[PDB]
Each structure stands twice: as structure tokens, then as C-alpha cells.
Design a binder for this molecule. Structure first.
Ligand SMILES: *c1ccc([N+](=O)[O-])cc1C(=O)Nc1cccc(OCc2ccccc2)c1
Lengths: 9, 258
């Protein structure tokens, strides 16, 4: 779930 | 009392809602009723008008359009979540899991602002794509959007406001009953506060309407299945279409989910 993590930070 | 703190939470969320989402329900209805000095949106009823519309395969093109906009929605929703007091202080893996399950529930919820019986506002209120035209698309794409329309006609009946929606959305995000959460207590702690803020909101903003709050929590449970149905039709579309490429972010969400 990289993008979601990237979006969250 | 606490009542003050709940009004304070309501405004905070409305403000971050209104920042995060450029086309509010108010703006959207204004366009749809025609009660605005802007140009009425370019109606799309068939392949010809679609083609003339592009200025401002077919079924795959529309779904590719639908898909690119879904991603912007997720970006906006994720931004809004961060403004929900205490959402960010949660475990980052929980943050991810709440969003993973929530986004499509919220997309449905907020799509309804953009639609009526006959069609849906697209491209930031500048296009109006008809329900008749989306039905007429061939399987599986014909009946992809119809369930959203059916939900929306019932949901919109509740006549909710942008202020009501701002809290409702926050409540949907912070659902502690999502599969795979690691620390449910703090999630529930906040959803309690939000639900109270929601209950007050509705009492104040809709004093004429009693038990909107109750009706509204009933919808929130329909939505989970409606979102399941939706996720299954993405599983159908991914598999049967070799020509159709799903977008990455949408994979992340779709994968392992129901
Ligand atoms: C279309 C096609 C595929 C998917 N998918 O998740 O695989 C989704 C969609 C889709 O319908 N997304 C969509 C369509 C129309 C509007 C929209 O954004 C509305 C919105 C904006 C801001 C907040 C909440 C919802 C998304």
C-alpha cells in the first residue's frame, strides 16, 4: 500500500 | 458545555471539507437547478455529443475517465482525513486501513451531491452525463454506475447540507469495525465524538426533521454492501478485460478488500 502511505505523508 | 466543543468540531470539519473538495453540494445543486449565472453544462447523451464534449474504445474511454477522477477523489479524501482531529495520531497502518475501506463509501456519498434522477455532473460541474447514456453502455459497463444512481436518489431525499456531509464523512472514515485494525480504542474514541457532533448538527441544522440522524445511520450500513457490490464489479472488470488497465492506487484499495 505504498501510494496510500506516500499520500498520508 | 460539551455542546460547544461539538459545534467547534463541526465547523473545523466543514472548513476542511470545503477546502478539500472544490465542488460543494451547494455549488452542484445551483448548477443542476439552473439557479446560477454560469453557462449550463455541456450535456452528454450519446457517442456523438460525448465526442463534441471532449473539447470541454468508447466504454473503456469513459471508464478510464471515471477512473482518473476516482484517483483525484482519493487524493482529496485522504487530505480531508488528515484534518479530522486525532486521525493522524493513530497508527499509520490503521490510517491506511480506515481509508482503504472508507474512500469508496465516501465517493458514493459525495457522488450523490453531483447527481439527480436523470444524470451526473462531471468535469467540475461543466459536463452533465446522462443516466440513460451510462445504462446504454454494454455489459459490464452498462450497470457499473446505475447502483450509484439508485443509492443517490434515496440518499439525496434526506436533503443533507455540506455541513451535515462534512461530519457524516468523518464518521464513515473513522469506523472501528474495519477488518485488520490494530488499535480500535482510539478510533472508536473519535467516532464517538464525531457521532455526537453529527447528532447535534442535525438537531440544530434540521430542527424540523426528527430522526434524520437515525435514518442517516441506516444508510451508512446499506453503503457497505453497495461498496462490496462495487468492489466485486471491479474484480469482474479487471479479469474479463485484457484491454482495460486498472490504475495503481485503485489496485491498492481493491486488493485484499472484501
Ligand atoms: C469509476 C471507474 C472505476 C472506479 N474504480 O474505483 O475502479 C471508480 C470510478 C468512479 O466512479 N469514481 C468517480 C466517478 C465520479 C466522481 C468521482 O468523484 C466524486 C467525489 C469527489 C470528491 C469527494 C468524493 C467523491 C469519482
Amino acid at each position: 500500500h505504498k501510494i496510500l502511505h506516500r499520500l498520508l505523508q | 458545555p460539551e455542546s460547544a466543543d461539538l459545534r467547534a468540531l463541526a465547523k473545523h470539519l466543514y472548513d476542511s471539507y470545503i477546502k478539500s473538495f472544490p465542488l460543494t453540494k451547494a455549488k452542484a445543486r445551483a448548477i443542476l437547478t439552473g439557479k446560477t449565472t454560469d453557462k449550463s453544462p455541456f450535456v452528454i447523451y450519446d457517442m456523438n455529443s460525448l465526442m463534441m464534449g471532449e473539447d470541454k474504445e468508447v466504454a473503456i474511454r469513459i471508464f478510464q475517465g471515471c477512473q482518473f477522477r476516482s484517483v483525484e477523489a482519493v487524493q482529496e479524501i485522504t487530505e480531508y482525513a488528515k484534518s479530522i482531529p486525532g486521525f493522524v495520531n493513530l497508527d499509520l497502518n490503521d490510517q491506511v486501513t480506515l481509508l482503504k475501506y472508507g474512500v469508496h463509501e465516501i465517493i458514493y456519498t459525495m457522488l450523490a451531491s453531483l447527481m439527480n434522477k436523470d444524470g451526473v455532473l462531471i468535469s467540475e460541474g461543466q459536463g452533465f452525463m446522462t443516466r440513460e447514456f451510462l445504462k446504454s453502455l454494454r455489459k459490464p459497463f452498462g450497470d457499473f454506475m446505475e447502483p450509484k444512481f439508485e443509492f443517490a436518489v434515496k440518499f439525496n431525499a434526506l436533503e443533507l447540507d455540506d455541513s451535515d456531509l462534512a461530519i457524516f464523512i468523518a464518521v464513515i472514515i473513522l469506523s472501528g469495525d474495519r477488518p485488520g485494525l490494530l488499535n480500535v480504542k482510539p478510533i472508536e474514541d473519535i467516532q464517538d465524538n464525531l457521532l455526537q457532533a453529527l447528532e447535534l448538527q442535525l438537531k440544530l441544522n434540521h430542527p424540523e426533521s426528527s430522526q434524520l440522524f437515525a435514518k442517516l445511520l441506516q444508510k451508512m450500513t446499506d453503503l457497505r454492501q453497495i461498496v462490496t457490490e462495487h468492489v466485486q464489479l471491479l474484480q469482474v472488470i479487471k479479469k474479463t478485460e485484457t484491454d482495460m488497465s486498472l490504475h495503481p492506487l485503485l489496485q491498492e484499495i481493491y486488493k485484499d478488500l472484501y
